Structure 1
Amino acid sequence: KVVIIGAGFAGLVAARELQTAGIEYEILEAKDRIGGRAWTEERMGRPLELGATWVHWFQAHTWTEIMRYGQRTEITASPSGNDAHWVTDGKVVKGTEDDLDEKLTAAMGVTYEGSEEYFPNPHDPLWVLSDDFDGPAEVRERFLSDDQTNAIDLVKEAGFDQETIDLVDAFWCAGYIGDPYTGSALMAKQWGALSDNRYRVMEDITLKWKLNNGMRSLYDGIAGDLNTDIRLNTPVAKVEHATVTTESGEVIEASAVICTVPVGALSNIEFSPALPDAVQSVIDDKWNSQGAKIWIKIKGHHRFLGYAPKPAKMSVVRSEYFMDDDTTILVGFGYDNTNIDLNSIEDAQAVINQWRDDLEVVDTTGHNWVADKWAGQAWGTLRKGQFTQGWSLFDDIDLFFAGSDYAYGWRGVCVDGALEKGMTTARQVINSMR
């Protein structure tokens, strides 16, 4: 009688884990679909990922599901060797993708400066603050200071030129899914630590390999294993911790509640008792994910890569599919969901016009996760101070919080973190039950 709130990857894998242990469960999902912020949907002639897209075999939890559900060889690399463009002091620079990669690689070396001392085990991100920490007190001081520094200032303080600063600004507008200047640099350093402290591996893990059959092949796979029907169109309005009340007034009694609703949507639920003050502050300030993901279709087959810094409508845009009607579908990430209408052709044209006054856009699409009352955010990213006093505070309770945003590893940004934390939270419930 464990109630799981939400049928995203975290709730689905938690349900399967409870099923293995013979523990009764039920998933309540607000929407008329499963998958959450992973959503494979036919748009503009093709199945497109409106949320989660890229995977890698160095992501333990994602890769095990890829193997489980038959997708081992069903991955394809995104287009590479694109003609690259980047905006720096208001002007467009042209170059090779290798040119751009080399600049980012140099900047990442400084950005990841401090990961080998903080993250010898990159899956123990708070080791420096633990009582097992046996390093110099100065490392702890630097760790805490880095939570209050954004990733771009690290590159500025190292003396890189404005062209590199503008590239890194663009890069982290996309990576921090919002305003990178409010972000915690420790997020970037942990990404380095999980990627052998090498830019190319980090890009290999986060932005290279796509699922031919979509994230839906994984989340429908997990759902297909479940012996208990998921209750769609059943939003939870109250959690007593247990008792769950739906929006319709149904009261469902529970032994435990696994809540996978993300921070951007937690204010839809009334908790009794109230959540700890430190958790409420995070919800009030949420996380670093105010941006948006667009899919743009242009005439012709063009191998294109574009970078632009804040406040551009989109900061990273890249060719992804070359369609059979002589069009190209490009993906884009931007820092501010309110400065772009993902479904307006003129706004998508304005994006492409950041770099090339040609390349007319014939179609565009996307889902604005931040304006979605059941998400309220894109992928979770960290504001200043939220590495050490943010994601880890949802472990207290009494009611359990699970989701990518609380993972120890590829937190927020990857399905790997949802599969990690959904599974380990189910183990917390399993361990408590006898």
Structure 2
Amino acid sequence: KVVIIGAGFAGLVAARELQTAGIEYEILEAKDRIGGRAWTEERMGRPLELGATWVHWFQAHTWTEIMRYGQRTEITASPSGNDAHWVTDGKVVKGTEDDLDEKLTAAMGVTYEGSEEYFPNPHDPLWVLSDDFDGPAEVRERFLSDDQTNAIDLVKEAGFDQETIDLVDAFWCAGYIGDPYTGSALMAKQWGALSDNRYRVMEDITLKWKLNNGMRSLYDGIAGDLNTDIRLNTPVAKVEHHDNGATVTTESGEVIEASAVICTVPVGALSNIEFSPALPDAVQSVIDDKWNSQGAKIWIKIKGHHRFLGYAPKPAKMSVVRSEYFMDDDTTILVGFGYDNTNIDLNSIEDAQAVINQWRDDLEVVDTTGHNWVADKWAGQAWGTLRKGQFTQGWSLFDDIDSQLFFAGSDYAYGWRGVCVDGALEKGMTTARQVINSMR
């Protein structure tokens, strides 16, 4: 009766939540697999996370699922103490990972500026614009201004040198998984607020702990709890959501009647679906301009065991590259994040070699792999990140469509929005509660 579009984390957890409340549901998934932008897959000799990777116990929704499905002790920290390299004025600088972290720590203090005024409750990100806001008017003005400033310009305006600017550039190429100069600085400030306003905590939460058994241990766990079979290979083509009741049409023409529809399709893929009535104009403007996520994630295998960390600014093929696994055949698998999916072929050994050559032309790539989410018609983006203006006139506009259609997904979460599975688990669950409450 409730139709859930998409079997990623948000759709899976919404279905489990409805099952708890005794509400009949059905999940329709376009692909032949579940998990969405989380995807644990055997590649290059071991299970690799082609999408979501890192978790932390300060992520309430992710951590509860880790506890639920038996993964409490099945987390391992990524390699640290790497030999660090960074590109600044066309030159490669070498240093310790500590050197690099201290530079970013100093830059983040200026980058998080204002988070204490904006985000006393970091899970109420739009409090400053609410009628309950009781702070000075200049805080609201600065808040709105910060939505139109990118995170790098904050560091430039504070007077940091070019070396730190280039490091911060590289860092936010990865963090905005796209052009950081078009991004909203409020995204970075909320990450600060969710991380006790300390760089080390923010990196602990988003870039440290991996699941030994992969994200699939969690999404297969949730799917295993569902008493209703997921309909794979069943793309939705149209959603009707007039007051009478909702209707969903698949690509094959099958029409399914619904009491409500929970749509977890990401903005980058929403143009595949015809909505009747059409979505609100402000929602359509976000879909047309999408979100800040045009980048890509690579896994590169090189010869030898090397503890490597590399940073490079836009327009590098990859902006952050780090050792992750030391393999038994004397090779290293590194992970990389780059701002532009169209400037990198994730499966081309020569392209991966060009990435490594940004820092060290003496290392030799022997294999490489990745999934270009942006070119995937069922995603059309990497993790959701915010362009200028989308913190206050972006992710929040997808709530309160009507009583028949509800949008759920990490990209609309109040907390760790877009960048984390925590946001998908948050928003899938609370959107199911919206339906439960309406039905009660």
Cα shift readout 1:240-282 (whole Å, capped 9, x = no counterpart): 0x00000000000000000000000000000000000000000
1:205 equivalenced with 2:205 (yes/no): yes
**CA distance in 2: counterparts of 1:75 and 1:356, whole angstroms:** 31
In 2, distance between residues paired with 1:276 and 1:311?
Answer: 35
1:260 & 1:100 partners in 2: Cα distance?
A: 38
Distance 2:363 2:98 in 1: 22
1:296 offset after TM fit, Å? Answer: 0.0
1:362-417 alpha-carbon deviations (Å, 9 max, x no partner): 00000000000000000000000000000000002000000000000000000000
Residue in 2 that maps onto 1:419? 425
Counterparts of 2:152 and 2:274 in 1: how far apart (Å)? Answer: 38
**In structure 1, what is the Cα distance between the partners aligned to 2:233 and 2:182?**
36
Partners in 1 of 2:327 and 2:211 — Cα distance?
A: 17
Query: CA separation in 2, counterparts of 1:5 and 1:24?
Result: 14
Q: How far off its partner does 1:29 sit?
A: 0.0
For 1:319-398, list aligned pairs within 5 A. Answer: 319-398=323-402
Give the ranges of 4+ consecutive aligned residues of structure 1 lying more than 2 Å apart after TM superposition: none
CA distance in 2, matches of 1:357, 1:207: 26
Query: What's the CA shift for 1:420?
Result: 0.0
Q: Equivalents in 2 of 1:319, 1:108: separation in Å?
A: 24
- Separation in 1 of the partners of 2:432 and 2:152? 37
Structure 1, unpaired ranges of 5+: none
Q: Deviations over 1:211-239 (max 9, x none)?
A: 00000000000000000000000000000
The offset of 1:102, in angstroms, is 0.2
**2: CA distance, partners of 1:124 / 1:326:** 48
Deviations 1:298-347 (A, max 9, x none): 00000000000000000000000000000000000000000000000000
In structure 2, list runs of 5 or more residues that go unmatched.
241-245
Q: 2 CA distance for matches of 1:96 and 1:250?
A: 59
* Percent identity of equivalent pairs: 100
Match of 2:301 among 275, 297, 301: 297
- In the superposition, the TM-score normalised over structure 2's length comes to 0.98
Provide the rounded CA distance (Å) in 2 between the counterparts of 1:402 and 1:103: 37
SS at match of 1:189: helix
What is the CA-CA distance between 1:419 and the residue it aligns to?
Answer: 0.0
Q: Corresponding residue for 1:43?
A: 43
Using the size of structure 1 for normalisation, the TM-score is 1.00
User: In structure 1, what is the Cα distance between the partners aligned to 2:226 and 2:191?
Assistant: 33
Helix, strand or coil at the partner of 1:425? helix
Report the alpha carbon displacement of residue 47 of structure 1 after superposing the two structures with TM.
0.0
1:263 matched to 2:243: no
State how far apart, in whole Å, the 1-side matches of 2:177 and 2:435 are.
32
Cα offsets for 1:145-186 (capped at 9, x unmatched): 000000000000000000000000000000000000000000
Offset of 1:204 from its aligned partner? 0.0
Q: How does 1:166-315 map to 2 (within 5 A)?
A: 166-240=166-240, 242-315=246-319
What's the CA shift for 1:288? Answer: 0.2
